[PDB]
Nucleic acid binder design. Structure first.
Ligand SMILES: Nc1nc2c(ncn2[C@H]2C[C@H](O)[C@@H](COP(=O)(O)NP(=O)(O)OP(=O)(O)O)O2)c(=O)[nH]1
Ligand SMILES: [Mg+2]
Ligand SMILES: [Mg+2]
Length: 430
DNA sequence: ATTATGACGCT
DNA sequence: AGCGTCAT
């Protein structure tokens, strides 16, 4: 009753750039704008692998992970942009720099947590309180929410999508109690006003469009963001959770799309997030552990406590390359040469990071995959990173991995390597 | 022959 | 420390 916490204490948004790498290439090359187009890495094998797809191309069935030649079967007029190649590998610098453009704009409004190259959580609680004091009990006009959907509305007592959006928004705004400065629904609404402003600033100052979710925690904000894409934002209220979760497959919630979510489905014999409410917290803990069980018990009621961490910059800087099938590295000279290529890219990125961000990495992690292993990493070894020098980093990476070589011969490498991965970690202020 | 990352949990 | 999970 009155002591049951409802998880309505914060206003959290999740901003995700629409088809990011595509938008970056479309800004640079206007010929690609408003066209079916995709971004690929490499070219020789089946036209390259697609990693980003414009919404026009998605309409033809083009997806991430698809080979470009196969996508062209679905969409013969598909336009392609390729990721830059440097030192024999994909170089994603253009997209990292575009990411910084967007994250620096978002940081003007609130503290953000960089979740990926194109997404960030925003903790809007304090900004909402400030705006509410400015409003002085003034109602919120639908004009302030021109791209907002209210999940679950309209309901009750109409043909086109924009008319649906506006009907639901008007139902929502009509029911708002703007008298109460601590009303969670009001707070979410003001949060959505601020996110309209943030998204407008991003588009004005970069050209990039994005979608967003606004709710009371990170998981609901992330889920909300996906409900109306592209170039729209969605508000998920605490009250909308029972209906939303009643038909929501468990795998759609962040962290449940893998083995744990499958085990929830299999062990409990359920399909939808809402069905989890019928288990006690101890029952869920008995199946999935203390932490997961408590998290599931609260999350299926719309409640989650994970904070938006104050972190705009990535925690690691890494370089990796796969060597599939017949291109696997089978000689010592080969392994050394590719370690050097990776190390030279890493040195470039690390030196720029030190100048930009007043920090230095202190640990180098070396990960490899060997032929036949189905895992992502076959072996992971760390050493000290004491100087931003590519020849030194590559020699040290070789030194920590050289004992994996089964070959009695000094020149040969067996079993050949299907992936090399260098990662700079454990940053310190400088 | 999906690739290139990045965050984080467990022991 | 080194390995596994989730994501995309
Ligand atoms: N190198 C690499 N980059 C990837 C991969 N997957 C995604 N990216 C890059 C390319 C993506 O542009 C970017 C952001 O990833 P999303 O938010 O998951 N997809 P997007 O923003 O394209 O579409 P949406 O409108 O549905 O959000 O990350 C990958 O496997 N490898
Ligand atoms: Mg995106
Ligand atoms: Mg994203």
């Amino acid at each position: 009753g009155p002591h049951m916490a409802t998880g309505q204490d914060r206003v959290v948004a999740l901003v995700d750039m629409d088809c990011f790498f595509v938008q970056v290439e479309q800004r640079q090359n206007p010929h690609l704008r408003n066209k079916p187009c995709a971004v690929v890495q490499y070219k020789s094998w089946k036209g390259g692998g697609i990693i980003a797809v414009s919404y026009e191309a998605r309409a033809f069935g083009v997806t991430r992970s698809m080979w470009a030649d196969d996508a062209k079967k679905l969409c013969p007029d598909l336009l392609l942009a390729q990721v830059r190649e440097s030192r024999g590998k994909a170089n994603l610098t253009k997209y990292r720099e575009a990411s910084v453009e967007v994250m620096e704009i978002m940081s003007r409004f609130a503290v953000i947590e960089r979740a990926s190259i194109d997404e960030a959580y925003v903790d809007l609680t304090s900004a909402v309180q400030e705006r509410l004091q400015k409003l002085q009990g003034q109602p919120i006009s639908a004009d302030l929410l021109p791209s907002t959907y209210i999940e679950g509305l309209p309901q009750g007592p109409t043909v086109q999508k924009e008319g649906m959006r506006k009907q639901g928004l008007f139902q929502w705004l009509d029911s708002l109690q703007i008298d109460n400065l601590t009303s969670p629904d009001l707070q979410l609404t003001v949060g959505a006003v601020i996110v309209e402003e943030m998204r407008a600033a991003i588009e004005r100052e970069t050209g990039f469009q994005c979608s967003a979710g606004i709710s009371h925690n990170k998981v609901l904000a992330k889920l909300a963001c996906g409900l109306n894409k592209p170039n729209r934002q969605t508000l998920v209220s605490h009250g909308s959770v029972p209906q939303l979760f009643s038909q929501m497959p468990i795998r759609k919630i962040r962290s449940l799309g893998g083995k744990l979510g499958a085990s929830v489905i299999e062990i409990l014999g359920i399909e939808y997030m809402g069905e989890l409410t019928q288990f006690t917290e101890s029952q869920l803990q008995s199946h999935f552990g203390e932490k997961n069980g408590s998290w599931l018990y609260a999350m299926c009621r719309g409640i989650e406590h994970d904070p938006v961490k104050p972190r705009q910059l990535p925690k690691t800087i890494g370089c990796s390359k796969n060597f599939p099938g017949k291109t696997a590295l089978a000689t010592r000279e080969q392994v050394q040469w590719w370690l050097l290529q990776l190390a030279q890219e890493l040195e470039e990125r690390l030196t720029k990071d030190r100048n930009d961000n007043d920090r230095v990495a202190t640990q180098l992690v070396v990960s490899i995959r060997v032929q036949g292993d189905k895992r992502l990493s076959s072996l992971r070894r760390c050493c000290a990173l004491t100087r931003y020098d590519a020849h030194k980093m590559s020699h040290d990476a070789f030194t920590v991995i050289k004992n994996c070589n089964t070959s009695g011969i000094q020149t040969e490498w067996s079993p050949p390597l299907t992936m090399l991965f260098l990662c700079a970690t454990k940053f310190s202020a400088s």
